[PDB]
Amino acid sequence: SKLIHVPKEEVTLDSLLEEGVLDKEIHKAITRMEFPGLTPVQQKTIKPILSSEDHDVIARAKTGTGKTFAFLIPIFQHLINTKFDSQYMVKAVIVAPTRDLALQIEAEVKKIHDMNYGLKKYACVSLVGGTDFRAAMNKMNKLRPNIVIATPGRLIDVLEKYSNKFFRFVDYKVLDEADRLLEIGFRDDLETISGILNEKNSKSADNIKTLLFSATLDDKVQKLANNIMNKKECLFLDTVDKNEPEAHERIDQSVVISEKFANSIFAAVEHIKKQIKERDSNYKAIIFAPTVKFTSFLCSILKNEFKKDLPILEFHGKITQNKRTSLVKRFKKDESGILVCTDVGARGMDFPNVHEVLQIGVPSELANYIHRIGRTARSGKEGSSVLFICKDELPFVRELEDAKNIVIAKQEKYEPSEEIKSEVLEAVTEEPEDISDIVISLISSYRSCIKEYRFSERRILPEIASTYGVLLNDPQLKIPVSRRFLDKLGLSRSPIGKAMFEIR
RNA sequence: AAAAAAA
Ligand SMILES: O=c1ccn([C@@H]2O[C@H](COP(=O)(O)OP(=O)(O)O)[C@@H](O)[C@H]2O)c(=O)[nH]1
Ligand code: BEF
Ligand SMILES: [Mg+2]
């Protein structure tokens, strides 16, 4: 308790200025960006967030509808109307599930800064992994930022060491893409963070206001966050009807269903090839893959196939953070190209004018389907989406309707010609051992979501394994492994293990 | 070994 709902039933910068809620400095900043007008969530979120009363804020809004400024504008306004207290102390802590999203939010704050130098006094520092710790701390000491954007790990590192120095006067903490940060693997980290910030706060352990933002969340998050929500009441600001699908309606969704999993790649290649020809290389797209190794492999194929027409960018968690930042900014700027990536780029990342979102296989989690396709059709723009799967993945499409009420109308089958298989497979440089590691990674990936997506383990896993045979152009062939490895896999008893591997 | 998450 206590969760108060406010379902989706005009607010303007000028009105907010004249009403006295917002200062001229920030009004100048947002007005100079020349947006047509505040998004519904911003209209529905700003004023309640500044309400000093003892209440937390949960906000659900579809993808690409400007949630970032929905909590950045209030933060800045808060910093304005508290400017003579604690000045050189952190007053707002923003947490994101990925480094690039945190750096993106930082860039948005610096975008706010560049539109009005008067707001630069309210400095900002990002705290993420893959960056020099000392340089960040020197930046912390030098700037005395009022806003911190961070990823949980590095934030915890900093908090364990400098909570007293910087974080004793936090008034706001923000969970962007809250639901993922409230999933297993992140919840304990955020509980430690909230605990430290609350423990270290100068006024009270319940002083801090918490903001939860995402395109995908329900009432379950209210329960999942009960330990990090200090205040007594909690506002639910929803710009989506209960039964309405969370997916952005402007996205033209489709699914390509194949007999086997491997030739969904062939399905995608035929799709992209059709797209570069029709659009005359004026094509900007993001293609998602379930795993790093498969991302890299798929990247190698798309490089062999389409490098002559478009840039092919490889984006995943094993890419050095410097290169991640370089390619996100490049793919942010460039007018065309193919971003080949895992779910690291599924949430939050804002790439202007992405034409299509492609998916080979399923996402690491069901909700990430909504966020994946959310990378296109942003800020009023149009967009389409294609899901490339095999028949044994069909239950996932079934799961999309039962839970999230997501109905993919356009569905079609696919069978590859011998020519494309020969052309693609002949142009693979990877040794059988690499193919083995890649397929093994896919087996591991699909095994971890058997329960979630209601897959038939006895059917889907052998199919994933068969990809090894397909790529080596011998469907009868099975993956060569050792007895210890097969035992280590724990399929020593399962017939599927025998059906999918060959102990050589 | 899955996708994230500083060591
Ligand atoms: O008042 C606004 C705020 C947002 N935007 C658009 O929304 C985008 C921001 O999307 P964001 O990622 O911040 O929202 P989210 O994806 O988190 O829902 C900007 O680039 C703008 O094009 C807009 O048109 N008017
Ligand atoms: F949901 Be938005 F893409 F951050
Ligand atoms: Mg966001």
DSSP A450-480: TTTTT--HHHHHHHHHHHHHHHTT-TT--EE
User: Cα(A496)–Cα(A458) distance, rounded to whole angstroms?
Assistant: 6
Distance of CA A96 from the midpoint of ligand 2 (Å): 11
Residue A146 tokens, joined: 């009022």
Query: What is the number of domains present in chain A?
Result: 2
Q: Which domain holds residue A43?
A: 2-244
Do residues A229 and A251 both lie within one domain?
Answer: no
Do residues A320 and A409 both lie within one domain?
Answer: yes
Do residues A195 and A113 both lie within one domain?
Answer: yes
Do residues A375 and A422 both lie within one domain?
Answer: yes
User: Cα(A495)–Cα(A458) distance, rounded to whole angstroms?
Assistant: 8
Please classify residue A457 by burial: count the beta carbons closer than 10 Å to its beta carbon, then call 0-12 exposed, 13-18 middle and 19+ buried: middle
- C-alpha distances out from residue A491 to A90, A254, A462, A482, A485, Å: 51, 35, 12, 12, 10
Last residue of a domain, one of A223, A244, A265: A244
Last residue of a domain, one of A201, A218, A244: A244
Q: Phi/psi at A377 (nearest 5 deg)? A: 55, 50
Do residues A163 and A274 both lie within one domain?
Answer: no
Last residue of a domain, one of A224, A244, A264: A244
Given ligand 2 and candidates A41, A67, A212, A370, which is best to mutate, with the most ligand atoms within 8 Å of its CB? A67
Q: Quick one: how far is CA A206 from the chain centroid?
A: 30
The angstrom resolution of this structure is 3.2
From the list A22, A8, A132, A34, the residue with the least C-alpha distance to A80 is A22
User: Cα(A100)–Cα(A80) distance, rounded to whole angstroms?
Assistant: 27
Q: Which nucleotides of B are covered by protein (CB under 7 A)?
A: 1-7
Give yes or no for residue A216 CB within 6 A of ligand 1: no
Give yes or no for residue A379 CB within 6 A of ligand 1: yes
Do residues A145 and A271 both lie within one domain?
Answer: no
From the list A207, A192, A113, A114, the residue with the least C-alpha distance to A157 is A192
Residues with CB under 7 A from strand B: A 97-100, 128-131, 133, 150-157, 185-186, 189, 290-293, 316-318, 321, 342-344, 346, 364-365, 437, 440-441, 444-445, 448-449
CATH number at residue A11: 3.40.50.300
User: Cα(A215)–Cα(A433) distance, rounded to whole angstroms?
Assistant: 40
Residue of minimum CA distance from atom 11 in ligand 1: A66
CA geometry: angle at A33 spanning A25 and A349, to 5°? 115
Do residues A302 and A375 both lie within one domain?
Answer: yes
Do residues A259 and A224 both lie within one domain?
Answer: no
Beta bridge partners of A341: A288, A315
CA of A440 to C1' of B6 (A): 27
Do residues A220 and A249 both lie within one domain?
Answer: no
Q: Is A238 helix (H, G, I), strand (E, B) or coil?
A: strand
User: Cα(A286)–Cα(A344) distance, rounded to whole angstroms?
Assistant: 12
Do residues A372 and A227 both lie within one domain?
Answer: no
The experimental method is X-ray
Q: Phi/psi at A166 (nearest 5 deg)? A: -125, -30
Do residues A269 and A325 both lie within one domain?
Answer: yes
Do residues A300 and A210 both lie within one domain?
Answer: no
Q: Report whether A61 belongs to an annotated binding site.
A: yes
